[PDB]
Design an enzyme around this catalytic site. Structure first.
Site, PDB file in Angstrom:
ATOM      1  N   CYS B  32      14.151  -3.685  -6.989  1.00 21.34           N
ATOM      2  CA  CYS B  32      14.838  -4.357  -6.102  1.00 21.34           C
ATOM      3  C   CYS B  32      15.461  -4.730  -5.529  1.00 21.34           C
ATOM      4  CB  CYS B  32      13.306  -5.248  -5.825  1.00 21.34           C
ATOM      5  SG  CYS B  32      12.300  -5.582  -4.743  1.00 21.34           S
ATOM      6  N   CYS B  35      14.881  -8.604  -4.551  1.00 23.24           N
ATOM      7  CA  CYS B  35      14.860  -9.505  -5.647  1.00 23.24           C
ATOM      8  C   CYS B  35      16.550 -10.185  -5.813  1.00 23.24           C
ATOM      9  CB  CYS B  35      14.103  -8.844  -6.818  1.00 23.24           C
ATOM     10  SG  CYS B  35      12.805  -8.204  -6.801  1.00 23.24           S
TER      11      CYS B  35
END
Lengths: 105, 105
Positions: B32, B35
């Site tokens: 992700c 992140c």
């Protein structure tokens, strides 16, 4: 029926072979409770709508397809027509899944 | 500094040993993009605030901690005080991370 995607090459190929049809992709994760909750309803939609292609991408197997499609929540449904993304939402909402499919088909 | 959690037993133990202090948990995934974007800022917050405990749970290694904490978006930050969840939000928002830590500490 729902086509299980296990590579970036198989994803690209499927969006090419769909031709003119709407493609609905369910991005899911095995650990995510809402993903398990909506899986039977997603597979029922594939038997009801034979004119729409239904793809499943597990974000753990296809981390590269997940990053490139900028998925951040599970489940996320992305809608494509002629290779272009024409809709997207996140969450296990049955009514809105089916309602978006009837707007875009 | 940021404590890497690699089991449900280590998560429970960390929330017990925190005592009275705020615990901030970052639930993340390697795939992700948001992140990765917020990881240095999360590690800077741990050096700035020595009175707050900072935990990282990779949802791929701890699928069971991820399901039980009902994580659905990446990153999700959950805040705990004395074993009770007292705050939660999702998204890589730097200002809101630090602002919630100053409300709850």
């Amino acid at each position: 029926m729902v086509k299980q995607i296990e590579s970036k090459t198989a994803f690209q190929e499927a969006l090419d072979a769909a031709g003119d049809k709407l493609v609905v992709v369910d991005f899911s994760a095995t650990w995510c409770g809402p993903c398990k909750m909506i899986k039977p309803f997603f597979h029922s939609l594939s038997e009801k709508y034979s004119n729409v292609i239904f793809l499943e991408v597990d974000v753990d197997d296809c981390q590269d397809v997940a990053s490139e499609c900028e998925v951040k929540c599970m489940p996320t449904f992305q809608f494509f027509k002629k290779g272009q993304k024409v809709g997207e939402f996140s969450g296990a909402n049955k009514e809105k899944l089916e309602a978006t499919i009837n707007e875009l088909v």
